[PDB]
Amino acid sequence: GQVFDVGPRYTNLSYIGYGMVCSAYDNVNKVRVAIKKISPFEHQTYCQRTLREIKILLRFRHENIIGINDIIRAPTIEQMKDVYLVTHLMGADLYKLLKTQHLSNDHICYFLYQILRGLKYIHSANVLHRDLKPSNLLLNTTCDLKICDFGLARVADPDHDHTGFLTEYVATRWYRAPEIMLNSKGYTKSIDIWSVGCILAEMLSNRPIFPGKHYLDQLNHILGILGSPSQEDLNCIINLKARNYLLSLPHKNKVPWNRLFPNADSKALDLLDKMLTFNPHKRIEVEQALAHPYLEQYYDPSDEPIAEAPFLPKEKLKELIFEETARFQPGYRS
Ligand SMILES: CS(=O)c1ccc(-c2nc(-c3ccc(F)cc3)c(-c3ccncc3)[nH]2)cc1
């Protein structure tokens, strides 16, 4: 569509979707790759997201997470307008797949395992993805799953998690935990487990489980299935406005998982219940999730790696992005 000069090395560009994603042919490694164009330097926020993702993806090394094979940009800061990230092609994603394909229990089980195996590495690095959803889970022709889109990712900060009632949030609404609309900034690992739970539910019926039309409607959806929170769960919500809103709602009963998904594996529904738990403190953790009987055919903690090393003006951020992408320049490559 517009300028996408990825150099002589990458040819045969086919469009896909702070820029554009395209497929290309790697004339060196002889494989078909995916390249993403990012033009973020005009804004501080866009630069912060870009630097953040580049830093995270370059440090991370995992089969279930998109790795950066190459980065294309100009030789100087002055000439650098766009940055191109390159990785192995994954022809599809869960969103596209769930629109037309019904998943067998075996596929749901394999997909969930890969999501959690990847999430285990992300969390061991003290990082939170914060925006897990079907469009972020890429798949190739052999069913390998990789997590991408670390733009809203942050370092975990449980001690600074609390905020007020109705505090605006950045991530995709349908996959937001209930505590986000109540008293959480999303700085805890339990935020990702909820999203994964929503994804599982979506894989079981090919439909989003909590499709809120706006901020508060999202909570209405969650409480519609989980029912009214227990007194114990309400006691953990010290924020008055949040607790009082919950208390003002008429009693809602829990909708049984086996009633919502009558053709699902019982063990899958047991794990779904543990991931979609209202109370973030009682919510299952990624390693407990992996150890659940539903994934026993795949569980092998010794083959579920953890991270070796855990984790400003637009001008200085542009400078940092330049310095962060310097290792891929033709200089040392030659
Ligand atoms: C939630 S969303 O709209 C969203 C935006 C971009 C992407 C998305 N970004 C990439 C992509 C490409 C190169 C990179 F190095 C990094 C990411 C891909 C990609 C990677 C591998 N094979 C095919 C496509 N898809 C995925 C989800």
Swiss-Prot record:
Outcome after substituting K36R: Does not inhibit interaction with MAP2K1
Cofactors (names): Mg(2+)
Recorded superkingdom: Eukaryota
Effect of I56N: In NS13; results in increased MAPK signaling; reduced interaction with DUSP6; no effect on interaction with MAP2K1
Effect caused by changing T167A: Inhibits interaction with TPR
Residues annotated as catalytic: D131
DNA-binding region: 241-259
UniProt GO BP: apoptotic process; B cell receptor signaling pathway; Bergmann glial cell differentiation; cardiac neural crest cell development involved in heart development; caveolin-mediated endocytosis; cell surface receptor signaling pathway; cellular response to amino acid starvation; cellular response to tumor necrosis factor
Impact after mutating P305R: In NS13; results in increased MAPK signaling; increased translocation to the nucleus; reduced interaction with DUSP6; no effect on interaction with MAP2K1
Chief location of this protein within or outside the cell: cytoplasm
GO-annotated molecular function: ATP binding; DNA binding; identical protein binding; MAP kinase activity; phosphatase binding; phosphotyrosine residue binding; protein serine kinase activity; protein serine/threonine kinase activity
Domain remark in the UniProt entry: The TXY motif contains the threonine and tyrosine residues whose phosphorylation activates the MAP kinases.
Its job: Serine/threonine kinase which acts as an essential component of the MAP kinase signal transduction pathway. MAPK1/ERK2 and MAPK3/ERK1 are the 2 MAPKs which play an important role in the MAPK/ERK cascade. They participate also in a signaling cascade initiated by activated KIT and KITLG/SCF. Depending on the cellular context, the MAPK/ERK cascade mediates diverse biological functions such as cell growth, adhesion, survival and differentiation through the regulation of transcription, translation, cytoskeletal rearrangements.
Name of the protein in its database record: Mitogen-activated protein kinase 1
Originating organism: Homo sapiens
